[PDB]
């Protein structure tokens, strides 16, 4: 039931060079899809394990 748009919004806002008001939701979900195929960092992955 979780919509991951907030995660991508936080990501783009913390990049600090994009104005998220000009980023539509489909682009954010494409970013989510691309992020979903990346491996997790070793420390974060081990903490989650």
């Amino acid at each position: 039931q979780k919509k991951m748009k907030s995660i991508v919004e936080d990501f783009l806002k913390r990049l600090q060079i994009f104005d998220i008001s000009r980023v539509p939701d489909d682009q954010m979900y494409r970013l989510r899809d691309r992020l979903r195929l990346l491996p997790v960092e070793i420390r974060r992955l081990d903490i989650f394990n």
Partner: protein, 49 residues
């Protein structure tokens, strides 16, 4: 001519009943949360979440 024998009848019917018009008023209808609504293939209608 009026004939009593040829005019006396026994009319038969039911004692009492109640007639209803709205059959669907007898159905309690609820819906799942739209986030969990699924299509004919049992997958969620919208999956880009």
């Amino acid at each position: 001519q009026f004939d009593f024998r040829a005019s006396m009848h026994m009319l038969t019917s039911n004692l009492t009943f109640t007639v209803y018009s709205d059959l669907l008023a007898f159905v309690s209808a609820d819906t799942v949360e739209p986030i969990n609504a699924v299509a004919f293939d049992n997958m969620r209608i919208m999956n880009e979440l």
